Amino acid sequence: SLAEVLAETVRWLRLAREDPEAFAARVAALLADPDAFSPTEVAAAYVALAVLARERGDAEAAAAAERLGAHLLATDPETYLEAQVVLAAIEALLGREEEAEAVLEEALSRLTAANKGDKKDLLKAIKKLFEPEARAQLAAIAAVLDAADNVEAALARLEKWAERLEKELEHHH
């Protein structure tokens, strides 16, 4: 579930801050054998690593997130899509709307080119961000990121992004 990925992303991000050595050891473990961990855990580690890459300029986290994302795309496309939507929400939360939309577009393009997902999957996944269970966890992410004042406007921007996509989908039929 989307909200479980968010909840677990809170735990990964707090671990990176509060015990970086245990963060590094568990990431090495997931990179060595991601299939030994639950899909939610792999997706959350991907998101935390992608956030470290983008927000701290962490080259190793960047390459590690790329490997985990690739693995999720190849083996569990629905979890891949959830991971990308959560990453997009967090970038939007941080005020990086262009980056958030590029993440969604990359996710869409990888999913369709692999014949594992489509525009309707993306729309459905984005809208799961707005449910209460997911909103509670994004509030937790926002506490982690000192971005509480931007939760609503970030989700509103994503909703209009999804709305325009859905309208083009409708017009195209």
* Residue 145: other Cβ atoms inside 10 A: 17
- What the block records as the tokens of 156 is 């509103």
Under 8 Å between Cβ of 45 and 7: no
Resolution (A): 2.0
Number of folded domains in the chain?
1
Nearest Cα to 48, choosing from 30, 32, 36, 74? 30
- Give the DSSP letter string of 87-128: HHHHHHHTT-HHHHHHHHHHHHHHHHHTTS--HHHHHHHHHH
Query: Sign (positive/negative) of CA torsion 96, 100, 101, 102?
Result: positive
Instruction: State which approach was used to obtain the coordinates.
Output: X-ray
**Chain centroid to CA 22:** 22
Contacts of 145 (CB under 8 A, 6+ apart): 13, 90, 93, 94
Range of the domain at 154: 2-172
